[PDB]
């Protein structure tokens, strides 16, 4: 299958120890203190449209943002070989399941707190000699890596071949029809995180084809009148829950396979991704693919945070790197509505209408995060919000280039 994941631990943002305390270990949903196979656990049972977030976890990406620093704080293996222990907490045994208090009689060595520790994976020989059991850990660490190599939104990866969708892909995809993007992220992740799959498996090339097929919809290029291969995502009114996507199937005028491969990493600069279940789902839904199949190439050092500068085997700067086109939710959806008007889906009156109904919605996202960062600073201890600063929220980077990527990805 695959066994060689190069990771990278979360940044401290200038804080002493990793941003999380003792209580985070016995609060995680699902399997006790087991951080593995968590993420989409608090969403296992849907009650309604309202995004699941409590007091300690003020947002959607709050559950994951916490399991990240909690994850890295206990990742001496792959980066040292030992098991160590942070604040009296360690793994049960070599398989690395749930975290229990440091066992007596033979306690592990105390972990040396460090920021951004490069994970080699092969450094821990027990991993490959017990792959079929500790496989989820590979998918999860990969997630933490994509989240760590960015101070503003998880950097996933789109692709799309030069030729049309395989004959085994079109038959597998016709099963995730009436399924929201929020759920596609849950089924995608829970798939690549329980049993060692192959890089050329049917469910892998289809889930990847489902992610890049989602980006076009998010940009508006793959609407109701322009399918990639009969699949798209119908968006509801932004004032009436814009989180709803669903992979609808039609028989309209399909697009056409591009002249070349459109491999490209994408990011969401705007801190809006934090509270948007749709953005967090789109990110983690793509990460499920780069898990079973390590990074197709290296990531561009063009922008990114000041700590992801020249990583071991993650972010480069030469010619073997792939540019990262980052966008912004508000301008992206503002350009997404503009696509619908061009082909005649919406009236020229609903053009400037959907913009005001969405910008008001995205405002609620901004009014929420700003009010949560102040409530939960950073020097306090944890980092459920991630210090984004209020100077941003609307400084859209090359979002205009991400849109031009979708037009090129589906000619």
């Amino acid at each position: 299958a695959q066994r060689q994941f190069f990771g990278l631990t979360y940044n401290f943002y200038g804080q002493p120890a990793p941003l999380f305390d003792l209580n985070d270990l016995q609060e995680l949903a699902g399997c006790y203190a087991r951080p593995w196979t968590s993420r989409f656990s608090h969403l296992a049972i849907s009650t309604g449209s309202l995004p699941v977030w409590s007091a300690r976890y003020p947002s959607v990406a709050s559950r994951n943002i916490v399991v990240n620093t909690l994850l890295g704080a206990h990742l001496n293996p792959f980066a040292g070989g030992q098991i160590t222990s942070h604040q009296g907490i360690t793994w049960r045994d070599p398989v690395l399941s749930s975290l229990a208090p440091v066992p007596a009689i033979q306690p592990p060595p105390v972990w040396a707190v460090a920021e951004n520790v490069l994970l080699d994976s092969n450094n821990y020989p027990t991993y490959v000699l017990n792959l079929s059991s500790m496989w989820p850990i590979n998918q999860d660490v990969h997630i933490m890596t994509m989240w760590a190599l960015s101070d503003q939104g998880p950097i996933y990866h789109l692709e799309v071949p030069v030729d049309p969708m395989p004959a085994a892909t079109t038959a597998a995809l016709m099963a995730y029809t009436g399924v929201p993007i929020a759920h596609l992220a849950q089924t995608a992740y829970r798939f690549a995180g329980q049993l060692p799959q192959s890089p050329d498996s049917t469910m892998v090339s289809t889930i990847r084809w489902l992610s890049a097929i989602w980006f076009g919809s998010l940009t508006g290029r793959l609407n109701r009148s322009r399918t990639c291969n009969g699949f798209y995502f119908e968006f509801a009114k932004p004032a009436l829950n814009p989180d709803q996507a669903v992979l609808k199937w039609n028989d309209g005028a399909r697009a056409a396979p591009p002249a070349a491969a459109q491999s490209s990493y994408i990011r969401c600069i705007s801190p809006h991704w934090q509270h948007q279940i749709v953005e967090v789902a789109g990110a983690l839904m793509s990460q499920s693919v780069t898990a079973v199949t390590g990074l197709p190439a290296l990531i561009d050092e063009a922008t990114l945070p000041a700590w992801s500068q020249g990583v071991a085997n993650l972010t480069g700067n030469g010619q073997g790197v792939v540019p990262c086109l980052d966008y912004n939710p508000v301008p992206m959806a503002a350009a997404r509505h503009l696509q619908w008007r061009q082909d005649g889906l919406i009236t020229a009156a609903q053009e400037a209408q959907l913009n005001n109904d969405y910008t008001a919605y995205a405002l609620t996202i901004e009014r929420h995060l700003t009010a949560m960062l102040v409530a939960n600073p950073i020097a306090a201890g944890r980092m459920p919000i991630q210090p984004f600063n209020a100077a941003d929220f609307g400084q859209a980077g090359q979002t205009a280039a991400a849109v031009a990527l979708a037009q090129a990805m589906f000619v």
Binding site: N328, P331, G394, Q395, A401, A404, V411
Partner: protein
């Protein structure tokens, strides 16, 4: 459309100020309107022609397709945000600055390459006026060849590659008609790459020469408007500059 391509910049709806020249690591994509492709194609076309001489002499590097310097971006393409807003082009064909550099220095480097050979081919071609302007007139090929085998000075390049120059030549002189391989006879018609242009320059017996009579007119029209021949006997003060 024309000019550099722009794309929406920053938060907001597309608008006259949302736009910004889509520049980047390659320079700025400038749109390649229909006619401007005619030139770069007409320029590259005149180079590809010399294909048989590029391989023979191991220079060159394969045929130059203009589709190797362009791209298929899409956005609004104008001269300024304001006016670029009225030219939404989808998957247009733009050439990035750094590319507008190669298509330039390539056509320049190759242009030297051929300009040289093309000069040898000539001292040998015109060295037997392959151009008449009334009726026809042949000259049994054997003789012709066995003749230039002489005249041509020892430092040409038509003696080092005869049928490596000949193949280039056949496409420039509808006088030399190569003998077809599977009937071992000429063709009546001559098919030089300049098929049309060469057809429209022949001194057509009905009227001198369209290419001539056409220009001698546009030429005169230029002057007539230019110097200011019009107004030649105008009765009123005129700045000497006007002369």
């Amino acid at each position: 459309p024309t000019g550099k391509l722009w794309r929406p910049v920053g938060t907001s709806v597309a608008t006259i100020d949302s736009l910004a020249i889509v520049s980047d690591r390659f320079g700025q994509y400038s749109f390649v309107n229909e006619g401007m492709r005619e030139t770069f194609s007409k320029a590259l076309f005149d180079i590809n022609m010399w294909q048989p001489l590029f391989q023979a002499t191991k220079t060159g590097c394969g045929p130059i397709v203009l589709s190797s310097f362009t791209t298929t971006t899409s956005g609004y393409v104008g001269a300024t945000a304001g006016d670029a807003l009225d030219n939404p082009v989808t998957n247009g064909v733009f050439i990035s600055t750094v590319q507008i550099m190669n298509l330039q220095r390539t056509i320049a480097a190759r242009m030297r390459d051929v300009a040289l050979w093309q000069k040898h081919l000539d001292t040998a071609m015109t060295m037997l006026t392959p151009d008449i302007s009334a009726g026809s007139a042949s000259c049994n090929w054997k003789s012709l060849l066995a003749f230039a085998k002489d005249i041509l000075p020892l430092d040409n390049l038509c003696l080092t590659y005869p049928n490596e120059f000949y193949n280039v030549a056949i496409h420039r002189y509808p006088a030399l008609k190569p003998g077809n391989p599977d009937t071992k006879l000429p063709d009546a018609q001559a098919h030089p790459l300049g098929e049309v242009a060469g057809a429209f320059n022949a001194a057509t017996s009905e009227v001198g020469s369209l290419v001539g009579s056409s220009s001698t007119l546009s030429q005169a029209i230029s002057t007539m408007a230019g110097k200011d021949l019009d107004l030649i006997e105008a009765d009123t003060p005129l700045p000497v500059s006007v002369f």
